[PDB]
Amino acid sequence: MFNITASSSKEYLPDLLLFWQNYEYWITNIGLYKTKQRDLTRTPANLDTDTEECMFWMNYLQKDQSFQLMNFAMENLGALYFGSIGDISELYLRVEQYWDRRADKNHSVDGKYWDALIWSVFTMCIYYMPVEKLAEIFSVYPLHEYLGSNKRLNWEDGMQLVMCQNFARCSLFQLKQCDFMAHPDIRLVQAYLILATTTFPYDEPLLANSLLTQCIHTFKNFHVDDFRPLLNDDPVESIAKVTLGRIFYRLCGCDYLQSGPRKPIALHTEVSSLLNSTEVLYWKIISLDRDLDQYLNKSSKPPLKTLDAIRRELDIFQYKVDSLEEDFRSNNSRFQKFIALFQISTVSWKLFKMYLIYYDTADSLLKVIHYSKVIISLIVNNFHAKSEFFNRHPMVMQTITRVVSFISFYQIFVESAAVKQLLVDLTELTANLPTIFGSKLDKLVYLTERLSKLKLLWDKVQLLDSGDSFYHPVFKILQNDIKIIELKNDEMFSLIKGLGSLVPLNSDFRTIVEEFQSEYNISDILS
Amino acid sequence: MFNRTTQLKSKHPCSVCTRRKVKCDRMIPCGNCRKRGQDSECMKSTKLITASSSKEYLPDLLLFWQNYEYWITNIGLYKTKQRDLTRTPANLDTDTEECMFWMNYLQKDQSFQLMNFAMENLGALYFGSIGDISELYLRVEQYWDRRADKNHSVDGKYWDALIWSVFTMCIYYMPVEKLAEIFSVYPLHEYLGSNKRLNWEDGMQLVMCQNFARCSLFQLKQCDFMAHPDIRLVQAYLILATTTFPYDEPLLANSLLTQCIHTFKNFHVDDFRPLLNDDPVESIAKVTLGRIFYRLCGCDYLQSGPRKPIALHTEVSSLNVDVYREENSTEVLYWKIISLDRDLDQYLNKSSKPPLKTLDAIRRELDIFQYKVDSLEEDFRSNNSRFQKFIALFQISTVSWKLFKMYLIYYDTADSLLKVIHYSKVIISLIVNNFHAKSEFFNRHPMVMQTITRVVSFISFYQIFVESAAVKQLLVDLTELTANLPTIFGSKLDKLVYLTERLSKLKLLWDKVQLLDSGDSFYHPVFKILQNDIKIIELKNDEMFSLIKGLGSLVPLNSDFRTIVEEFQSEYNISDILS
Amino acid sequence: SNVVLVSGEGERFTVDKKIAERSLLLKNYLNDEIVMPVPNVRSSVLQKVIEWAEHHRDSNFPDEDDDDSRKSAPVDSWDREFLKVDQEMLYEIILAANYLNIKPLLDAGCKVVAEMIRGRSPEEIRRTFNIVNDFTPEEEAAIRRENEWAE
Ligand SMILES: [Zn+2]
Ligand SMILES: [Zn+2]
């Protein structure tokens, strides 16, 4: 963060924005979403629990409710399942079949694969449905009869998330009934790409990395490299290879979105960088974001040629996103254009943030404030147009996390009025994000509150210097926030606990640091 | 499986093919001039007419053997599992009432006698995976203390799955005489419902071994091991890989191995040398992790194929690699002898010849590992030292056989057929030497099934085309040995006997139909049947049809020698080795 | 303490065990008297190999991986007087040392052939010009026309 008497210089700012490029990664990428601290001696384990739970949550959903879910997905969620399963009109027959052999006792692997796929689709339906449509279809009372929770809470205060997580667990339990590890098939990859459009990769991040590893194992089992149709092939096989192409691009998207220390086996590294036709656009924007955010963990700063080439490609894909037609009647196309425009605004914000950090280019802070206002004007627009389920997509939690964390970090050190009004807008928007994110929204509010209280400590404590480095308690607290979470992401102690009888044994500056860390601990963004 | 390819090739292209400006099949005289009947107009440079009294199809037929070995005896016999998903059942109500019997069937003193058998005999197998087993007696005590409980932790169920994998390894390697002293057979027959006269040597030890392996996997499923990656998963799979579990369930073992790669690489420890700034517990932890790494690389290479795309072995033993020659030779000696085997068996499906400098380097490392296995301690009061000696000696005999097989095939050097016969007799004399008492279970390790498969398939292939006496006596000896292999291999042993019988009937077909000379190539129904076996099993290993069946209601729409080929393929089908 | 080297013709040669561990293929065969087949080597050639191993019981040879200690090693006086034999039987001694994996006999028996390839007259390098073909007759005529001016 920094590289005795006092001073008031600005040497710490170019060495501190480069520290933000490490802090953004190790907090807001890994420690907030991709770190699940676990204790195996405390965690329960039986199949006498998840069997009856899945029995209840499958006997709870009825036949008339499921087709209403599927109609909601057909009308409103067309931008999500098309990369995974294509057309959902083909899947009505499989829902009909699941209600045909629901009462049978001798199932097959193929049938339970279609059941797991449609229960992943049902999870996607429950996750993206507004509460006004969800309260009409379902009833809250048998769920409080079974779970034992108090009956005073409706869907809006954290009950839709419980049913979403339990339907995701039902899809995973039907995959376990498939014995999917003994039978690799594309329904595993499709059901996981449907489940990855929810907060399932952030509720169970170590399970989602194992499912993604099984999807990489299942996909590469087919050994299909090129997805272009050959003239000599059967025209069923060519459509099948186009289907694997549009599944492969979505799978590389999720493969990038789950990148971390707990996901070592990769697939997105085997796609070359750029340095239907709306599905490839999403992968182009995600690959450009992959080109940007690879500089977080590494220390080698990017060249200006790289950032300029990303800027020209950003303008090209900005024109391609702005050239997308949209119908205000067809809600699928509105959600499609929202996804494309929000992704390209996220990549634009990250690009001009890297301009501001790595080079301190003039008129780059104005670009960061401008694209942050563009992200706000994309999210606040959904509350006015009865499309509030647009703000449930997992990209708007990651992007708002990065944006409010950087604006809080920049408001700590560099004072500005536009940045302060932008921080007030980000705080109100983070308070106005949907409750389907659950605990991650509370942890983002806690992290924004912690970086706001750290501004007071930067104000009330004078910066010192030793002639070459700048000592301040805020700097040491920001060092230790990375040190603690890198300790939590160290699998050496779990290795020692796994091997057996090997047991692990382990001025006013330091006082201010320890009192702040005892009051605002960084281990409260963990679960 | 057919070109001309005669002995005594010419140096320059002939005068006729330069007169005509075409390619030259650079033989003496040619394949391209013998096609047109211009034999005498090409010989006239020196000596002339030389005597090509050999069998010319043999070099490009051995180069075909290099592909036939890979597609039959490696992939199609062991690593191919034909499954229709519309007919395979799928329910977890089956294993909760099946594996519950196998967990209530094993008693306490029976399990401690299994653990005593492992401690006294099988030390060459678990000590790579789990280390010393006196630490694991406490875990068996904790399993029988926590047996009657209701709320099991994940940490306890990992030790339960690990010791049930150890019990699977015990049941697989226990002799039938020691097995009958421990287990009764009649409640097991009352549960399974079969013939009462079906004692352990008749095929029930394999059933109990497979069901104990399925119980270890069932307790791993009760761990929910995908949500909780832990090194005990990798240890339990390395114990289960010492049996015929990766050949009974060759697609379940690949997914478990992929999860073991994901679990291992989650620790992000690439260098296993303990640093100077380490906890002394962390140093021993990294030493144990380094042993588990090379055991996992061995079990990771031994399942390589088209149905296992995610690999772990990324280091080379000769000449971008990461992790080799930094580790002390205690159990990398099992990897260094397999990494020396990977260098040979990478040229099976590859259509290029290995360079002879590589083969000479491999021969030098063969001599070095011969002296290194001769430089081992001989604990005469320990039975697992002789089993470690047999493993590390049978592997170097296997790699020696494969090295001189590739010398015979690709280059035909000095007495390389006699070296193939010599190391085949060394493999026989290592397996027949274990037919004595106190070491009969040494012949149950899956490397002897793989090695005897490769050796008897190459000798049965070479007996078809080359009439000899040493090769024929060697084939009689390996037929007797394949008849005398342990019955715990079971279906793979019966399929190996079927493949040897198919090659013998193909030899009988070779001595019947006259070989059709065609100038530059030959033609025979034996050649076409051997061409078609690879095409059939490559068709069975094409997952495009399961892909089309997965993506929806899509349905895939797709002379004199032909009668002989179709009647032999209808009589002796190559699809009878898949099941 | 004795092994038997069965030749290709069927004769049994009882050799002392420490002397016969000069062969790397036999010393690895002993991990299983102890008889072993040597299928291609005649009785006389195997007798020569065994006499060579009898003399070099206490000798010290290079480490089989040497750059100059193996190439620039001169032959012994016994090795040069020992290999004043027929040429085809010399090559069969080399084949016997190649099969039995005796690297120093495949060294000292194989420097003699190297001393016979060099050290020969240019007259019978001129004579043995295309005894194996190696050249088109147009190129043979061009070569013989190129150096015709000398003789
Ligand atoms: Zn020619
Ligand atoms: Zn010719």
Side-chain angles (χ1 to χ4, degrees), chain A residues 2 4-527, chain B residues 2-319 321-579, chain C residues 1-32 34-151:
Chain A
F2 59 95
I4 60 171
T5 182
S7 179
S8 296
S9 179
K10 291 181 182 179
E11 182 67 27
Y12 65 97
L13 187 64
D15 193 75
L16 184 63
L17 295 175
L18 293 174
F19 178 73
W20 171 256
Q21 284 294 107
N22 216 173
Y23 189 83
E24 179 176 358
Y25 183 75
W26 283 104
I27 306 298
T28 62
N29 194 3
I30 307 300
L32 185 58
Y33 296 103
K34 298 179 178 67
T35 299
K36 183 175 174 66
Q37 182 57 254
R38 68 196 186 278
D39 195 359
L40 296 175
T41 62
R42 297 290 300 274
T43 306
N46 53 2
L47 291 175
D48 202 2
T49 301
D50 57 354
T51 54
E52 289 84 2
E53 187 72 26
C54 185
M55 289 300 109
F56 175 72
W57 285 101
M58 293 195 293
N59 290 319
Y60 173 72
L61 186 142
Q62 295 177 356
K63 186 175 180 180
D64 55 354
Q65 296 172 354
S66 66
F67 290 101
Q68 291 175 355
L69 294 175
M70 293 293 286
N71 288 318
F72 179 77
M74 184 181 72
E75 291 177 353
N76 289 314
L77 293 176
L80 295 174
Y81 59 85
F82 184 74
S84 177
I85 65 171
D87 195 2
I88 204 165
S89 297
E90 189 179 2
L91 199 64
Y92 289 166
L93 182 61
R94 298 294 185 268
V95 177
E96 287 288 333
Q97 289 177 357
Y98 168 68
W99 290 108
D100 287 332
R101 57 250 172 96
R102 180 67 177 87
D104 290 331
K105 294 183 184 293
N106 296 114
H107 293 89
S108 65
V109 180
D110 186 74
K112 298 300 291 185
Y113 265 151
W114 289 111
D115 297 338
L117 181 61
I118 65 164
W119 274 94
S120 66
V121 173
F122 292 160
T123 304
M124 184 180 72
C125 294
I126 293 299
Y127 178 74
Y128 285 99
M129 187 173 287
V131 65
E132 293 87 4
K133 292 182 181 180
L134 197 278
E136 293 179 353
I137 301 170
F138 290 91
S139 178
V140 196
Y141 292 157
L143 305 182
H144 295 290
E145 182 68 28
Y146 180 75
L147 274 73
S149 296
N150 51 0
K151 294 181 184 292
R152 275 86 67 191
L153 65 91
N154 212 168
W155 295 108
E156 56 91 20
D157 52 357
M159 194 65 204
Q160 186 179 3
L161 180 59
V162 176
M163 180 166 68
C164 174
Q165 291 176 357
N166 286 315
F167 283 175
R169 189 174 297 115
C170 289
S171 178
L172 294 172
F173 184 74
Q174 288 177 352
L175 288 172
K176 291 180 182 179
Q177 283 185 350
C178 293
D179 289 330
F180 69 100
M181 294 177 72
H183 302 92
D185 197 0
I186 202 66
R187 270 79 58 86
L188 175 65
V189 180
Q190 289 178 353
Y192 183 72
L193 290 176
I194 296 298
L195 288 174
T197 61
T198 65
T199 57
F200 172 72
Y202 307 113
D203 290 331
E204 293 290 328
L206 277 73
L207 182 60
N209 290 320
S210 297
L211 266 297
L212 184 65
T213 302
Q214 289 299 112
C215 290
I216 295 168
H217 174 73
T218 303
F219 184 80
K220 289 184 179 180
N221 197 2
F222 302 114
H223 295 286
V224 175
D225 291 330
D226 195 1
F227 302 103
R228 293 178 292 172
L230 294 175
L231 77 161
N232 55 4
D233 290 332
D234 195 1
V236 179
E237 183 178 0
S238 67
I239 298 172
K241 290 189 286 185
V242 172
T243 303
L244 259 72
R246 59 101 180 271
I247 288 170
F248 173 71
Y249 289 160
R250 182 67 66 192
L251 187 61
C252 290
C254 296
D255 188 77
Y256 172 69
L257 289 174
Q258 299 182 4
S259 297
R262 303 283 78 77
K263 183 256 182 184
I265 295 171
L267 181 62
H268 64 280
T269 62
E270 284 83 3
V271 182
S272 298
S273 66
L274 277 75
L275 298 177
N276 53 5
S277 179
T278 188
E279 185 67 29
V280 65
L281 181 64
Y282 291 163
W283 172 246
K284 295 294 184 182
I285 299 170
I286 289 167
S287 65
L288 192 62
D289 196 2
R290 182 186 64 186
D291 290 330
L292 288 177
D293 289 334
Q294 66 181 357
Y295 294 103
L296 294 174
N297 52 4
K298 65 176 71 175
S299 65
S300 66
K301 59 183 289 294
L304 286 171
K305 293 182 183 293
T306 302
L307 296 177
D308 287 331
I310 291 168
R311 186 175 180 178
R312 274 98 175 98
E313 293 178 354
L314 182 71
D315 197 2
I316 294 299
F317 291 113
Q318 179 68 43
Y319 181 74
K320 290 184 183 293
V321 169
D322 291 330
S323 296
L324 291 175
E325 58 92 20
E326 57 90 19
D327 193 1
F328 291 100
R329 294 180 291 112
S330 178
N331 211 169
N332 291 317
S333 181
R334 291 179 65 189
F335 181 58
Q336 172 184 355
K337 187 175 174 65
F338 175 71
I339 290 171
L341 190 58
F342 191 81
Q343 284 296 110
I344 201 69
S345 296
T346 303
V347 175
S348 300
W349 182 78
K350 291 180 181 179
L351 178 64
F352 287 104
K353 181 180 70 67
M354 290 176 71
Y355 276 110
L356 182 62
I357 288 170
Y358 288 100
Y359 292 97
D360 195 73
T361 305
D363 289 331
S364 294
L365 180 60
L366 185 63
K367 293 290 181 68
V368 170
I369 295 168
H370 182 270
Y371 284 108
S372 297
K373 289 182 183 292
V374 169
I375 292 167
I376 292 169
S377 180
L378 286 175
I379 295 171
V380 176
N381 197 4
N382 296 320
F383 300 106
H384 296 169
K386 292 181 181 179
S387 67
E388 294 179 354
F389 66 96
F390 289 182
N391 294 322
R392 295 184 180 181
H393 198 277
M395 68 185 178
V396 309
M397 190 64 203
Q398 299 291 321
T399 301
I400 290 301
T401 297
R402 303 294 181 89
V403 169
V404 75
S405 296
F406 179 72
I407 296 302
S408 295
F409 184 81
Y410 194 79
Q411 187 54 250
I412 290 169
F413 298 103
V414 177
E415 293 181 354
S416 179
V419 178
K420 187 175 180 180
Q421 185 65 41
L422 184 62
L423 184 61
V424 173
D425 289 332
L426 262 302
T427 302
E428 185 177 0
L429 193 147
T430 304
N432 287 319
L433 286 176
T435 61
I436 206 67
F437 297 105
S439 65
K440 299 294 186 291
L441 185 60
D442 293 331
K443 292 176 185 293
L444 181 60
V445 171
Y446 177 74
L447 184 63
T448 303
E449 185 178 1
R450 188 177 186 272
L451 292 173
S452 70
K453 296 294 183 182
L454 191 63
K455 181 177 173 65
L456 278 74
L457 192 62
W458 178 259
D459 288 331
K460 71 183 289 184
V461 177
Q462 186 178 3
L463 179 62
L464 296 175
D465 56 347
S466 179
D468 189 74
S469 296
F470 291 170
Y471 290 164
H472 199 275
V474 171
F475 290 165
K476 183 69 176 177
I477 293 162
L478 291 174
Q479 293 297 116
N480 289 318
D481 293 334
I482 294 174
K483 295 292 184 182
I484 293 298
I485 288 177
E486 288 181 353
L487 184 64
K488 297 292 178 67
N489 287 313
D490 194 2
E491 291 291 327
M492 184 62 72
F493 294 101
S494 66
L495 194 153
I496 295 169
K497 291 180 176 67
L499 290 180
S501 296
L502 296 174
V503 56
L505 279 75
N506 291 318
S507 66
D508 292 331
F509 178 79
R510 185 177 175 87
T511 302
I512 287 169
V513 169
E514 290 179 353
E515 288 293 326
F516 187 79
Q517 293 176 0
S518 66
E519 186 177 1
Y520 294 100
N521 196 0
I522 200 65
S523 295
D524 290 331
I525 66 170
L526 297 174
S527 293
Chain B
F2 52 93
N3 282 317
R4 196 263 177 90
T5 316
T6 189
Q7 189 61 256
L8 293 174
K9 274 78 70 177
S10 66
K11 282 91 174 66
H12 57 276
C14 70
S15 65
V16 177
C17 291
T18 60
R19 190 263 300 163
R20 192 171 61 196
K21 300 295 186 291
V22 298
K23 63 99 178 178
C24 182
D25 183 72
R26 195 182 294 171
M27 300 304 114
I28 290 177
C30 271
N32 201 1
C33 294
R34 187 174 180 267
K35 185 69 179 294
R36 291 183 183 270
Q38 293 179 356
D39 182 77
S40 65
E41 295 293 327
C42 185
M43 294 297 292
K44 292 181 181 179
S45 65
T46 52
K47 340 163 172 189
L48 300 158
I49 78 179
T50 187
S52 179
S53 296
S54 178
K55 292 183 284 188
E56 293 179 353
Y57 52 87
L58 190 65
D60 284 330
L61 186 59
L62 293 175
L63 294 177
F64 177 73
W65 170 255
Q66 281 292 107
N67 214 172
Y68 191 81
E69 179 179 359
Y70 180 74
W71 284 105
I72 306 300
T73 62
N74 194 4
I75 303 300
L77 185 57
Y78 295 102
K79 296 176 183 177
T80 301
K81 184 74 173 178
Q82 183 61 255
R83 295 293 93 190
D84 291 332
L85 297 179
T86 61
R87 293 179 179 90
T88 303
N91 194 359
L92 289 175
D93 200 4
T94 299
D95 57 353
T96 55
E97 67 186 2
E98 180 68 27
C99 180
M100 186 177 177
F101 174 72
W102 293 101
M103 291 184 286
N104 290 318
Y105 174 74
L106 180 64
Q107 295 179 357
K108 186 176 180 180
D109 54 354
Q110 294 177 356
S111 67
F112 283 104
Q113 287 176 354
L114 291 174
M115 293 294 288
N116 289 319
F117 181 79
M119 184 270 289
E120 292 177 354
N121 286 311
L122 295 176
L125 298 174
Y126 60 86
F127 187 76
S129 176
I130 64 172
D132 188 72
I133 206 166
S134 297
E135 188 179 0
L136 197 65
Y137 287 167
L138 182 62
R139 297 295 184 268
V140 180
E141 287 289 332
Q142 289 177 355
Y143 170 70
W144 290 107
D145 289 331
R146 199 176 60 246
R147 178 65 180 169
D149 291 333
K150 294 182 184 293
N151 296 116
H152 295 91
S153 65
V154 182
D155 186 76
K157 298 299 290 183
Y158 273 113
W159 293 110
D160 299 339
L162 179 61
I163 65 167
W164 273 95
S165 66
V166 171
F167 293 156
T168 303
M169 184 182 71
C170 294
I171 292 298
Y172 179 76
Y173 285 99
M174 184 170 285
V176 61
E177 294 87 4
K178 291 183 180 180
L179 189 70
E181 294 177 354
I182 302 171
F183 291 93
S184 295
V185 204
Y186 296 98
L188 196 151
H189 277 95
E190 289 293 327
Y191 180 74
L192 292 179
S194 64
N195 293 318
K196 302 284 102 174
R197 279 84 61 193
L198 211 156
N199 201 358
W200 300 109
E201 67 270 15
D202 294 331
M204 192 61 77
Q205 183 176 3
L206 178 59
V207 176
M208 183 170 68
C209 175
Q210 290 173 356
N211 287 312
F212 283 174
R214 189 175 296 115
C215 276
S216 178
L217 299 180
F218 178 71
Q219 292 179 355
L220 287 172
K221 291 179 183 179
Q222 285 183 350
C223 295
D224 288 331
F225 68 99
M226 296 178 71
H228 301 92
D230 197 0
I231 197 64
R232 285 168 286 172
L233 172 67
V234 181
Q235 289 179 353
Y237 182 73
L238 288 175
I239 301 300
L240 289 174
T242 62
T243 68
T244 57
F245 171 73
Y247 309 115
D248 291 330
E249 294 291 328
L251 271 67
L252 180 60
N254 290 320
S255 297
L256 289 167
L257 183 62
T258 302
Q259 286 294 321
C260 290
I261 296 168
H262 174 74
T263 301
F264 181 80
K265 289 184 179 179
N266 198 2
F267 301 112
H268 291 286
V269 179
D270 290 330
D271 195 359
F272 308 103
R273 294 170 291 174
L275 294 174
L276 190 145
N277 54 3
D278 288 331
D279 195 2
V281 181
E282 183 180 0
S283 295
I284 302 169
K286 289 193 287 185
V287 170
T288 304
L289 190 71
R291 292 178 181 176
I292 295 169
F293 171 68
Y294 289 98
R295 186 71 180 174
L296 187 60
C297 287
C299 295
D300 186 73
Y301 174 68
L302 290 174
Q303 302 181 5
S304 297
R307 303 284 79 79
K308 186 258 181 183
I310 296 170
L312 182 63
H313 51 86
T314 56
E315 68 270 16
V316 181
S317 181
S318 66
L319 293 174
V321 298
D322 295 332
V323 288
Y324 187 68
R325 287 183 190 276
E326 60 190 2
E327 190 68 27
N328 212 167
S329 297
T330 176
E331 289 173 352
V332 310
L333 188 273
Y334 182 72
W335 168 250
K336 288 184 178 180
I337 205 164
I338 288 174
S339 69
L340 194 62
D341 197 4
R342 181 187 61 191
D343 294 330
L344 294 175
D345 290 332
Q346 67 181 357
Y347 293 101
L348 293 174
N349 54 3
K350 190 181 264 78
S351 66
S352 67
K353 294 182 173 65
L356 213 292
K357 185 263 298 296
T358 297
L359 298 178
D360 291 334
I362 289 168
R363 187 175 180 179
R364 180 59 185 167
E365 280 111 21
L366 258 61
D367 292 332
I368 294 169
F369 294 129
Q370 282 289 333
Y371 276 89
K372 192 178 264 78
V373 72
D374 291 333
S375 178
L376 293 177
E377 61 183 0
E378 48 180 0
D379 292 331
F380 289 162
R381 293 182 184 271
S382 180
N383 199 4
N384 55 6
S385 178
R386 293 188 293 114
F387 181 57
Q388 184 177 1
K389 181 73 173 178
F390 172 69
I391 291 171
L393 189 63
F394 191 80
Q395 285 296 112
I396 191 67
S397 295
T398 302
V399 180
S400 300
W401 183 78
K402 293 180 183 178
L403 179 68
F404 288 101
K405 178 180 70 67
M406 292 177 72
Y407 275 113
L408 178 63
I409 290 171
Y410 289 100
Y411 293 95
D412 196 2
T413 186
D415 293 332
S416 60
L417 179 61
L418 297 174
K419 299 293 279 288
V420 169
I421 295 169
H422 180 270
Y423 287 107
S424 298
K425 290 182 183 293
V426 170
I427 291 166
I428 291 172
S429 179
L430 287 174
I431 294 171
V432 174
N433 199 3
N434 289 320
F435 285 162
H436 296 170
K438 196 173 72 175
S439 67
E440 195 271 331
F441 63 95
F442 289 183
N443 295 322
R444 292 182 180 179
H445 200 275
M447 71 182 179
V448 311
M449 190 63 205
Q450 294 291 320
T451 302
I452 288 302
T453 299
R454 302 295 183 91
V455 177
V456 80
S457 296
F458 178 70
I459 298 301
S460 296
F461 181 79
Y462 194 78
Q463 188 64 39
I464 296 170
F465 303 100
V466 177
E467 294 179 354
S468 178
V471 182
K472 186 176 180 180
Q473 184 65 41
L474 184 64
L475 184 59
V476 171
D477 198 0
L478 273 102
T479 302
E480 182 178 1
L481 192 145
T482 306
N484 287 318
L485 283 177
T487 61
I488 201 162
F489 299 110
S491 66
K492 298 294 186 291
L493 181 60
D494 291 331
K495 289 173 183 293
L496 181 61
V497 174
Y498 178 74
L499 182 61
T500 303
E501 183 179 1
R502 187 178 186 271
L503 291 173
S504 67
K505 298 296 181 183
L506 192 63
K507 177 178 171 65
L508 268 69
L509 185 61
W510 178 258
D511 292 331
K512 184 177 180 179
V513 181
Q514 192 268 331
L515 182 63
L516 191 146
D517 192 359
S518 178
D520 55 354
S521 67
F522 288 159
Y523 288 99
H524 201 274
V526 169
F527 292 164
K528 185 68 176 178
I529 294 160
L530 290 171
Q531 290 293 116
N532 288 319
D533 293 336
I534 292 176
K535 291 181 181 179
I536 289 168
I537 287 179
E538 286 178 353
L539 185 63
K540 302 292 178 66
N541 289 314
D542 193 0
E543 290 291 326
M544 186 62 72
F545 294 98
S546 66
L547 191 155
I548 292 169
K549 291 179 182 180
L551 291 180
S553 295
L554 298 175
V555 176
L557 294 174
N558 290 318
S559 179
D560 198 3
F561 288 167
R562 294 181 185 271
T563 302
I564 299 168
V565 169
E566 288 180 353
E567 288 293 326
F568 188 81
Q569 290 176 358
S570 67
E571 184 178 0
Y572 294 101
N573 195 1
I574 199 64
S575 296
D576 291 331
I577 66 170
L578 276 71
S579 179
Chain C
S1 66
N2 288 319
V3 298
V4 173
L5 295 175
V6 176
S7 67
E9 295 177 353
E11 293 186 357
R12 292 181 184 270
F13 287 160
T14 300
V15 189
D16 186 74
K17 184 178 184 292
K18 187 176 180 180
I19 295 169
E21 284 180 353
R22 180 66 65 192
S23 177
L24 294 172
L25 183 140
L26 177 58
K27 188 173 174 67
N28 298 324
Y29 186 81
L30 292 173
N31 294 116
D32 179 72
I34 298 168
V35 303
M36 62 97 72
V38 185
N40 204 3
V41 178
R42 295 181 295 172
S43 296
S44 179
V45 176
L46 186 63
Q47 183 68 42
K48 296 290 284 183
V49 170
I50 290 163
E51 290 177 354
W52 186 82
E54 284 291 330
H55 190 204
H56 292 281
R57 180 180 63 246
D58 293 331
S59 296
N60 206 164
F61 293 110
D63 204 1
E64 298 183 356
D65 287 326
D66 289 334
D67 194 1
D68 57 354
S69 298
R70 181 181 171 183
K71 292 173 73 71
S72 67
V75 300
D76 196 0
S77 296
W78 182 263
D79 288 332
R80 187 177 290 274
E81 293 292 327
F82 177 75
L83 296 168
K84 292 182 181 180
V85 296
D86 194 1
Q87 187 65 39
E88 195 272 332
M89 199 269 282
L90 176 62
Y91 296 127
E92 194 171 1
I93 291 173
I94 300 169
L95 288 167
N98 206 166
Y99 182 78
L100 294 174
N101 200 0
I102 304 171
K103 185 63 71 177
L105 183 59
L106 190 62
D107 189 359
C110 186
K111 289 183 284 187
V112 178
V113 180
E115 289 292 328
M116 292 183 72
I117 292 174
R118 66 176 178 174
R120 63 182 174 179
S121 177
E123 182 69 26
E124 65 100 18
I125 294 174
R126 184 183 67 84
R127 187 177 68 244
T128 61
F129 176 69
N130 283 328
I131 312 299
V132 67
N133 295 114
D134 198 78
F135 287 102
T136 64
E138 294 88 4
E139 285 180 351
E140 181 178 0
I143 291 161
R144 293 183 185 273
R145 189 178 297 113
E146 183 178 1
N147 56 12
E148 184 67 28
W149 62 271
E151 181 68 28

